[PDB]
Design an enzyme around this catalytic site. Structure first.
Site, PDB file in Angstrom:
ATOM      1  N   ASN A  85     -45.839  46.948 -28.663  1.00 54.64           N
ATOM      2  CA  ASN A  85     -45.582  47.875 -27.214  1.00 54.64           C
ATOM      3  C   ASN A  85     -47.383  47.958 -26.863  1.00 54.64           C
ATOM      4  O   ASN A  85     -47.960  48.762 -27.730  1.00 54.64           O
ATOM      5  CB  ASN A  85     -44.812  48.573 -28.734  1.00 54.64           C
ATOM      6  N   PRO A  86     -47.760  47.347 -25.808  1.00 49.97           N
ATOM      7  CA  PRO A  86     -48.859  47.396 -25.701  1.00 49.97           C
ATOM      8  C   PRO A  86     -49.569  48.417 -24.582  1.00 49.97           C
ATOM      9  O   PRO A  86     -48.532  49.293 -24.515  1.00 49.97           O
ATOM     10  CB  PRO A  86     -49.187  46.237 -24.248  1.00 49.97           C
ATOM     11  N   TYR A  88     -49.999  51.591 -21.758  1.00 54.11           N
ATOM     12  CA  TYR A  88     -49.246  51.330 -20.620  1.00 54.11           C
ATOM     13  C   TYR A  88     -50.384  52.314 -19.948  1.00 54.11           C
ATOM     14  O   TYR A  88     -50.316  53.403 -20.357  1.00 54.11           O
ATOM     15  CB  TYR A  88     -48.062  51.977 -20.259  1.00 54.11           C
ATOM     16  N   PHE A 176     -37.667  56.228 -24.319  1.00 60.59           N
ATOM     17  CA  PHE A 176     -38.960  56.498 -25.115  1.00 60.59           C
ATOM     18  C   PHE A 176     -38.902  58.399 -25.028  1.00 60.59           C
ATOM     19  O   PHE A 176     -39.254  58.729 -24.021  1.00 60.59           O
ATOM     20  CB  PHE A 176     -39.927  56.409 -24.891  1.00 60.59           C
TER      21      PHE A 176
HETATM   22  N1  LIG Z   1     -48.689  50.135 -30.356  1.00 60.76           N
HETATM   23  C1  LIG Z   1     -48.811  51.074 -29.802  1.00 60.76           C
HETATM   24  C2  LIG Z   1     -49.018  51.483 -28.610  1.00 60.76           C
HETATM   25  S1  LIG Z   1     -50.384  50.715 -27.748  1.00 60.76           S
HETATM   26  C3  LIG Z   1     -51.417  52.579 -28.677  1.00 60.76           C
HETATM   27  C4  LIG Z   1     -52.679  51.453 -29.313  1.00 60.76           C
HETATM   28  O1  LIG Z   1     -53.803  50.731 -28.814  1.00 60.76           O
HETATM   29  C5  LIG Z   1     -54.876  50.924 -29.313  1.00 60.76           C
HETATM   30  N2  LIG Z   1     -55.088  50.094 -27.801  1.00 60.76           N
HETATM   31  C6  LIG Z   1     -55.345  51.058 -26.917  1.00 60.76           C
HETATM   32  N3  LIG Z   1     -55.755  49.924 -25.861  1.00 60.76           N
HETATM   33  C7  LIG Z   1     -56.147  48.898 -27.202  1.00 60.76           C
HETATM   34  C8  LIG Z   1     -57.001  47.319 -26.764  1.00 60.76           C
HETATM   35  N4  LIG Z   1     -57.775  47.235 -25.316  1.00 60.76           N
HETATM   36  N5  LIG Z   1     -57.121  46.566 -27.647  1.00 60.76           N
HETATM   37  C9  LIG Z   1     -57.013  46.910 -28.903  1.00 60.76           C
HETATM   38  N6  LIG Z   1     -56.387  48.066 -29.445  1.00 60.76           N
HETATM   39  C10 LIG Z   1     -55.845  48.914 -28.597  1.00 60.76           C
HETATM   40  C11 LIG Z   1     -54.861  52.484 -29.223  1.00 60.76           C
HETATM   41  O2  LIG Z   1     -56.279  52.651 -30.293  1.00 60.76           O
HETATM   42  C12 LIG Z   1     -53.653  52.736 -30.053  1.00 60.76           C
HETATM   43  O3  LIG Z   1     -53.706  52.691 -30.986  1.00 60.76           O
END
Ligand SMILES: NCCSC[C@H]1O[C@@H](n2cnc3c(N)ncnc32)[C@H](O)[C@@H]1O
Length: 393
Positions: A85-86, A88, A176
């Site tokens: 889940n990237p 947003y 969500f």
């Molecule tokens: N998978 C859960 C939702 S996305 C939130 C997570 O993504 C991480 N995160 C945000 N941007 C990122 C990036 N560019 N690369 C790797 N992790 C990232 C944040 O630190 C957080 O732990």
DNA sequence: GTTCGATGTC
DNA sequence: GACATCGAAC
């Protein structure tokens, strides 16, 4: 940010990897997708998580954790399965947008991503990056906003997915808790072609996919929930965009700096109208919702068409069609402004009635559900208008 | 010119 | 849930 366990379970049900395959969770934090995949499929895989924040990275010893910005990460080897889940959000100034990085970092993202368009979004960049990291025939399963199905900012993304492999989209909706976002799951495989669109039903047992439609020659067109009825209505009349030029209102900063604009009412001044002045079939000319006033006659200095009575259609009332004829021709700060093309004859009253009709509300709700809190231009220009409301010479 | 929102605020 | 951003982004 967390992903509900039944969403994780549904995504894991769509995921596969060969024995000994490389399985990646981007933006992983504690790695819930790695954990769920391992529980369901066993231990004979190479599990990797990538996380930018050292405070967040917390994987079991059976996974490799890498501290990196996923979007700029360059591993030695591609992956069989990428799931997660990237994050947003739009990258921009903190007063208006949620993701805050140096301009230099944003420049690196723009350089890295062929699909970057307009303001774009981290979730689009994460999708592109993931596809680039897949082995041929590899699988990606992500949960993301539904907005890329329809929005112009994601046109290059849709075209990229369409040419890079085969895509299945599963509508979830607002799943969500305490997040205002309508979501889809994308299952993409880096081989073959075409699009499959799926609805879902949620039960105690979890989510069940329901096949909705298939587009075997998808080339990145807007994705909609079509039916026999939406098709039947669309061929019944001319697209609205064939009858009208569609323009948008001048934006708030344009009014705010204009020498004719005032912050208080006064003689000869009228309100600069917003979506709150627009109702189905009528315009409220009296109430001020913008904090801005100006002489009606000077409105044309912002947009020439403010001088001319014309059709106005709402942009931010959700996925609905709300229309009125602006008989007076006022300054507007919001909404679509429709100007008849050459040779077009219209019955304003009847056309407005049609646009506001229950049939029309059902039509757009069917096609676009709740992907975005708007009627967008790409939706509006396709609304069918039979020759009785509006007819082209 | 016009787009977009893990929307913003009631 | 009602009822819509509004301005930095390009
Ligand atoms: N998978 C859960 C939702 S996305 C939130 C997570 O993504 C991480 N995160 C945000 N941007 C990122 C990036 N560019 N690369 C790797 N992790 C990232 C944040 O630190 C957080 O732990």
């Amino acid at each position: 940010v967390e992903t509900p366990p039944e969403v994780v379970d549904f995504m894991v049900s769509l995921a596969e990897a060969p024995r000994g395959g490389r399985v990646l969770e981007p933006a992983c934090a504690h790695g819930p997708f790695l954990r769920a995949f391992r529980e369901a499929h066993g231990t004979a895989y190479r599990f990797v998580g990538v996380e930018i924040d050292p405070k967040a990275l917390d994987l079991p010893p059976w996974a490799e954790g890498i501290l990196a910005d996923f979007l700029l990460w360059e591993p030695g080897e591609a992956f069989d399965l990428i799931l997660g889940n990237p994050p947003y959000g739009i990258v921009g100034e903190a007063s208006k947008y949620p993701i805050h990085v140096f301009k230099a970092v944003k420049d690196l993202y723009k350089k890295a991503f062929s699909t970057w368009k307009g303001k774009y979004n981290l979730y689009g960049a994460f999708l592109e990056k993931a596809v680039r990291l897949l082995k041929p025939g590899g699988v990606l399963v992500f949960v993301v906003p539904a907005t890329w199905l329809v929005l112009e900012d994601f046109a290059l993304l849709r075209e990229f997915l369409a040419r890079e492999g085969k895509t299945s989209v599963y509508y979830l909706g607002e799943v969500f808790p305490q997040k205002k976002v309508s979501a889809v799951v994308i299952r993409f495989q880096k081989s073959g072609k075409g699009l499959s669109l799926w609805d879902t039903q949620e039960s105690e047992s979890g989510f069940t996919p329901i096949l909705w439609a298939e587009y075997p020659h998808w080339e990145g067109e807007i994705i909609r929930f079509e039916t026999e009825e939406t098709r039947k209505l669309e061929i019944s009349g001319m697209p609205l965009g064939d009858l009208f030029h569609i323009r948008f209102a001048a934006r708030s900063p344009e009014f705010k700096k204009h020498p004719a604009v005032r912050k208080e009412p006064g003689p000869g001044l009228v309100p600069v109208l917003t979506g709150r002045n627009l109702k189905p079939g009528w315009v409220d000319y009296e109430k001020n919702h913008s904090g801005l006033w100006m002489p009606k006659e000077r409105a044309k200095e912002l947009r020439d068409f403010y001088a001319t009575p014309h059709l106005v259609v709402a942009h931010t009332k959700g996925t609905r069609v709300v229309a009125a004829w602006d008989e007076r021709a006022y300054p507007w700060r919001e909404e679509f402004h429709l100007l008849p093309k050459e040779g077009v004859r219209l019955d304003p009253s009847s056309l407005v009635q049609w646009l506001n009709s229950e049939a029309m509300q059902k039509h757009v709700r069917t096609l676009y559900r709740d992907f975005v809190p708007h009627l967008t231009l790409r939706m509006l220009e396709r609304l069918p208008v039979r020759r009785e409301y509006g007819f082209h010479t």
